[PDB]
Design a protein around this ligand. Structure first.
Ligand SMILES: [Zn+2]
Length: 36
């Protein structure tokens, strides 16, 4: 539905997660990519 109760814009394409900013999501993507 269309409700004004949410604070997540970015979403992960590995674990179907969701973050607030590209940072919280970006730093997370690392857990997936073998960049670490
Ligand atoms: Zn993920």
């Amino acid at each position: 539905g269309s409700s004004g109760s949410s604070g997540l814009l970015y979403d992960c394409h590995i674990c179907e997660r969701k973050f607030k900013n590209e940072l919280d999501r970006d730093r997370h993507m690392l857990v997936h990519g073998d960049k670490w």
